[PDB]
């Protein structure tokens, strides 16, 4: 079963800016997933100190970088807190309209498009380079499930079919057919440098065979 749902609002004003706007700093989707990664990593760190056992599904707090030329994909991989069935659908959604809102008065007032974390709306930053986003994640207290999205003012929730995580979450960029030079290894080098150089976790690109 695949349950389909509307984007707030505002969330669909947001990710049709981010897909019209024209903007060629994109280089800043990485920093804003890094960041997000980051959050879901501190957030069970955190939670370990007073309940040891929330690391029961991974003791290991990292984030890989997989590009894959083939199928045209960037794959971030966090082993931090993962999200819940209602995280997904509407807890999150819920905390980034106030962000969205204000984020969108700040452009109209003279900001630009690389201020998006600062409102806490970074993830949707992901539309910048790709033309659909899945979301796998697997929360302690819920099931491993697939968040999917090619904007259009829908995304659709399913339980994951696939591979089991343990604790965590995959972002997979669908790339944009002229962005592949984000799947250029020398380019994720040059991002992560210049900004996600201080990010207290290991971050390990993924090379091709
Ligand atoms: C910020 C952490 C705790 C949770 C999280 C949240 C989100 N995220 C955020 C927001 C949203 C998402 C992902 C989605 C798919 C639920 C959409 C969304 O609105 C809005 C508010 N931001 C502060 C965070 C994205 C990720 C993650 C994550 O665990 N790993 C990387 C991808």
């Given at each position: 079963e695949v349950e389909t749902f509307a984007f707030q609002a505002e969330i669909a004003?947001?990710?049709?800016?981010?897909?019209?706007?024209?903007?060629?700093?994109?280089?800043?989707?990485?920093?804003?997933?890094?960041?997000?990664?980051?959050?879901?990593?501190?957030?069970?760190?955190?939670?370990?100190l007073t309940d040891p056992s929330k690391l029961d599904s991974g003791k290991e707090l990292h984030i890989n970088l997989?590009?894959?030329?083939?199928?045209?994909?960037?794959?971030?991989?966090?082993t931090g807190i993962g999200m819940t069935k209602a995280d997904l659908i509407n807890?999150?959604?819920?905390?980034?309209?106030?962000?969205?809102?204000?984020?969108?008065?700040?452009?109209?007032?003279?900001?630009?498009?690389?201020?998006?974390?600062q409102f806490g709306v970074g993830f949707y930053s992901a539309y910048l380079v790709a033309e659909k986003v899945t979301v796998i994640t697997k929360h302690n207290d819920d099931e491993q499930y697939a968040w999917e999205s090619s904007a259009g003012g829908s995304f659709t929730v399913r339980t994951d079919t696939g591979e089991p995580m343990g604790r965590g979450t995959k972002v997979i960029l669908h790339l944009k057919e002229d962005q592949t030079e984000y799947l250029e290894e020398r380019r994720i080098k040059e991002i992560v440098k210049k900004h996600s150089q201080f990010i207290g976790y290991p971050i390990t690109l993924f090379v091709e065979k």
């Open positions: 004003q947001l990710m049709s800016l981010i897909i019209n706007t024209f903007y060629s700093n994109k280089e800043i989707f990485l920093r804003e997933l890094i960041s997000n990664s980051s959050d879901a990593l501190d957030k069970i760190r955190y939670e370990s997989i590009p894959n030329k083939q199928d045209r994909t960037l794959t971030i991989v966090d807890n999150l959604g819920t905390i980034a309209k106030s962000g969205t809102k204000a984020f969108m008065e700040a452009l109209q007032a003279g900001a630009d498009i690389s201020m998006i974390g």
